[PDB]
């Protein structure tokens, strides 16, 4: 109970936080077919495009 | 009998909402405060300022009669 309300107090923090936003928009492009033969996995995939999770 | 720990027949639920108020004023509402209170400190300046150059306007009045 506890944690869920701390999250929440972070993303009130944080995220839509302007300057922070300002600093990460559009950093670090991944092409799909990067994302396969480059060999990223996990959150990167969750990330950018394919629906996989094991 | 045994002395596992179980949960007692089922706890409460735990929120998994982004909950967020979003409060405070709109655009208008806010702008228009500002413009306000703005025209607001307008109007006393000018008041003090013209009052003031009277003043002013008398102290010039008094070198003028100061000096020969």
Redesign the interface.
Known sequence: ?NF?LRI?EL??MLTNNRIWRNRTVDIGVVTAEDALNYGFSGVMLRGSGIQWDL | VKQDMPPVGGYGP???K???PRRGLSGYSMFAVGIGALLFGYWSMMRWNRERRRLQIEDFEARIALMP
């Open positions: 109970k869920s929440d993303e009130e | 735990i929120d998994y982004r909950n967020l």
